[PDB]
């Protein structure tokens, strides 16, 4: 898409329809005449286009109205309402842009933001842009959170987020124009290598993959068409379903064989009855020939009865010889029909041991993408965010993803090494109690109008809690926390002095020995300028490999690489790092997933702000005080950077509406 309609697409909005959010801010327009709606939509789309065409400078209302045409620039309040709406909700003027109107001299309201991840930083910038007092409290000695980047010398490798998942409708596309991001496309082709150290032939490397894709569609069929979603009260997982589908495919293989050999016995038993009839006929022919012979020995002249006997037995013999020939005819038909069926048997097995291992790599890859064992994923909902996937090739940040949070962090009040311990929220306001991570006895108190919590779902899950809420979070919030899945995947950074792999190959697989260890070092990335190989630990392996020292992990890495490229072509690594995301106290995992028993609705529950009870009983309904952003709060883009970014933008808009008032809704 291109033009004004492309700008709507690039902003994840339908170009020819008003969204639910737009309906709320402009109820006059959407409930009004169709012509006004189209004027609204064009104004919206055009303003978006203007911002998108140049996202390095602020787009003011004046600049917007200037470039609008008649009859669209006639209603200046409608233009002002639209622009304000778009600025408030972070569709325009978000990220890092040059301000035309320097920030308001004095600020209004005070917000404490827990965590300076991308979600935290995104909101912080917005709120500051709206003229609020903003302070971020980070536990780490750095910004970015789960955007971690290893740097040493020239070696640059991301231990956290690494991939921009397509620019088509990605807010990171806008950010990438604002920040010096060296975006390099990922070449799709990934050659697998079995345990032995040798490539899987394109023959099998397609039979298995196609079967893998077929097995997924099959689970989808199981879910939607057969309603196989609850088993023994427990919700069915993707793993359970995949197992069931495989078993039914092994069943069919056997069912085929059974009825094929059942075809053989039926024909072989027809032959048995025919051969019996033939043996019994050759018996009568044997006897009947003897009788005719004896009748012919009686030399002429003979009376008519004796002449008749000869003739009669002659007739009877050729008659029985007629039958036997027609039975030998049928014998030939049945005898070749048996060589027919025995020539083409059905499939011997569904999948061999070699096949099942290559399939396990495909399962591991899926376990990597969702950062969790397939037995934890919801069958019905694991892929609920598929419809919102971006268009275009996936890219990597070649200069390290940390460049993004660091760039967002500029000009913001960030307290590093500050671990939030308690969040207190009341009708009159909030206090956040944090400590210094270096000396834990040194205590800090932060008084604010509102708290934006961007704690990871892993953190929020902690038992006993790392952060206490006063009063406690309501049952509907904590149940969402327990239900939601928070998974895990790890990275091994291998820095060498020389490239010993195929430089035109970005990623290559390693097929594990067992189902149990399919995740273990199953994939390797070659993405960076410098000679770095990145090894992935997925599935059930991720959690276990964290209890193993770096040396052993690097050991197994070299072993695998030796098998593939040669035992002498693989030198010792100069620098190595191993991530441990489940162990990390400021993460307690990698990112959320739709657990069995959860749904996309839990993500909405997570995003819901908390409103304290009244101080004095009988006092009016208080303002909401505690707001939630972060990866685990955005239903349509969970477990991503752009999702985090967007959830930040969301909350900043909601908070500003609450504490600065929405002037654009009139």
């Amino acid at each position: 898409p291109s033009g004004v309609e492309g700008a709507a697409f690039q902003s994840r909005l339908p170009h020819d329809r008003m969204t639910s959010q737009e309906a709320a801010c402009f109820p006059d327009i959407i409930s009004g005449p169709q012509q006004t709606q189209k004027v609204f939509l064009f104004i919206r789309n055009r303003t978006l286009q203007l911002w998108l065409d140049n996202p390095k400078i602020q787009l003011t209302f004046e600049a917007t109205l200037q470039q609008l045409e008649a009859p669209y620039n006639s209603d200046t309040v409608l233009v002002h309402r639209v622009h304000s709406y778009l600025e408030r909700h972070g569709l325009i003027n978000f990220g890092i842009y040059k301000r035309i109107k320097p920030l308001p001299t004095k600020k209004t309201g005070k917000v404490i933001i827990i965590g300076s991840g991308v979600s935290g930083l995104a909101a912080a910038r917005q709120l500051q842009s709206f003229g609020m007092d903003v302070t971020l409290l980070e536990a780490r000695d750095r910004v970015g959170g789960r955007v971690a980047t290893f740097r040493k010398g020239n070696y640059v490798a991301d231990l956290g987020a690494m991939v921009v998942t397509g620019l088509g409708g990605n807010p990171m596309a806008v950010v990438s124009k604002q920040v010096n991001m060296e975006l390099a496309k990922i070449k799709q082709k990934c050659p697998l290598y079995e345990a032995n150290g040798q490539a899987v032939p394109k023959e099998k490397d397609e039979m298995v993959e196609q079967e893998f894709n077929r097995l997924l569609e099959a689970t989808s069929y199981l879910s939607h068409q057969l309603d196989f979603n609850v088993l023994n009260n427990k919700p069915v997982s993707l793993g359970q379903a995949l197992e069931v589908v495989i078993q039914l495919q092994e069943k069919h293989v056997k069912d085929e064989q059974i009825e094929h050999w059942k075809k053989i016995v039926k024909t072989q038993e027809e032959l048995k009855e025919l051969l019996n009839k033939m043996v019994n006929l050759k018996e009568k022919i044997k006897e009947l020939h003897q009788q005719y012979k004896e009748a012919s020995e009686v030399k002429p002249p003979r009376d008519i009865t004796a002449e008749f006997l000869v003739k009669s037995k002659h007739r009877d013999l050729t008659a029985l010889c007629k039958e036997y020939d027609e039975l030998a005819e049928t014998q030939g038909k049945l005898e070749e029909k048996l060589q027919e069926l025995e020539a083409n048997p059905p499939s011997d097995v569904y999948l061999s041991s070699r096949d099942r291992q290559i399939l396990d790599w495909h399962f591991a890859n899926l376990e990597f993408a969702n950062a969790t064992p397939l037995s934890t994923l919801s069958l019905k909902h694991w892929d609920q965010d598929d419809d919102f996937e971006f268009t275009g090739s996936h890219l990597t940040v070649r200069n390290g993803y940390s460049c993004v949070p660091v760039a967002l962090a500029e000009g913001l009040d960030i307290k590093l090494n500050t671990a939030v311990r308690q969040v207190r929220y009341t009708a009159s306001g909030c206090e956040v109690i944090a400590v210094n991570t270096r000396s834990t006895s040194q205590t800090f108190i932060y008084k604010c109008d509102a708290v934006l919590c961007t704690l990871p779902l892993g953190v929020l899950k902690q038992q006993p809690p790392a952060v206490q809420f006063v009063p406690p979070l309501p049952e509907w919030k904590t149940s969402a926390v327990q239900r939601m899945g928070f998974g895990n995947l790890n990275k091994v950074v291998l820095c060498f002095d020389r490239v010993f792999w195929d430089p035109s190959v970005n990623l290559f697989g390693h097929v594990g020995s067992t189902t149990a260890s399919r995740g273990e070092l199953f994939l390797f990335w070659n993405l960076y300028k410098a000679p770095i190989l990145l090894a992935l630990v997925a599935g059930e392996a991720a959690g276990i490999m964290e209890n193993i020292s770096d040396d052993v992990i690097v050991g197994r890495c070299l072993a695998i690489l030796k098998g593939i490229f040669g035992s002498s072509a693989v030198p010792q690594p100069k620098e190595t790092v191993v991530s441990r995301w489940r162990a990390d106290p400021w993460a307690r995992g990698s990112y959320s997933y739709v657990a069995a028993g959860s749904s996309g609705n839990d993500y909405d529950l997570m995003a819901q702000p908390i409103t304290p009870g009244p101080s004095i009983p009988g006092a009016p309904q208080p303002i909401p005080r505690l707001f939630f952003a972060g990866e685990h709060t955005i239903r349509n883009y969970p477990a991503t950077v752009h999702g985090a970014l967007l959830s930040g933008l969301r909350e900043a808009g909601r908070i500003a509406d609450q504490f600065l008032g929405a002037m654009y809704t009139l």
Binding site: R214, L215, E217, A218, Y221, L222, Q225, L226, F228, L231, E243, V244, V245, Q247, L248, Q249, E250, K251, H252, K254, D255, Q257, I258, W261, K262, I264, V265, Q268, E269, L271, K272, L275, N276, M278, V279, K282, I285, K286, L288, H289, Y292, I304, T305, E307, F308, K311, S312, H314, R315, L317, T318, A319, C321, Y324, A328
Partner: protein, 133 residues
């Protein structure tokens, strides 16, 4: 609406393989034994048929009679009439058999014989004695 191609999943089958913890292994074993059962049943009847084939060795070659090639005649020799009466006694209404016994009379001439020499050869009585066996 329908499963993927080369994929087999019926409501009935799903319920059967998910009935308990190892209903999967049970169903797959019952068919594993069913296959072995039918496989050895094949070799058994294969062995039986192999023996029956050997007893048929040589075919019916030393028992075939050369082809009698004679032209069809209209006149009835006393001989042929007498053959006919005996052929009726042994075969009844099988006009094809009777024709083959006599040798030089067509199937229709045989049927004609039945009406022409009906009273003179008491064919009614001859036929009723054929039915008596």
């Amino acid at each position: 609406r329908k499963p993927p191609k080369g994929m087999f999943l019926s409501q009935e089958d799903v319920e059967a393989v998910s009935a308990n913890a190892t209903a999967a292994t049970t169903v797959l074993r019952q068919l594993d034994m069913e296959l072995v059962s039918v496989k050895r049943q094949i070799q058994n009847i294969k062995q039986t048929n192999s023996a029956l084939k050997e007893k048929l060795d040589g075919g019916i070659e030393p028992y075939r009679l050369p082809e009698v090639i004679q032209k069809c005649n209209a006149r009835w020799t006393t001989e042929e009439q007498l053959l006919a009466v005996q052929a009726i006694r042994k075969y009844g209404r099988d006009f094809q058999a009777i024709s083959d016994v006599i040798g030089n009379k067509s199937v229709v001439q045989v049927k004609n014989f039945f009406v022409n020499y009906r009273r003179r050869f008491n064919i009614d009585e001859v036929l009723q004695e054929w039915e008596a066996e």
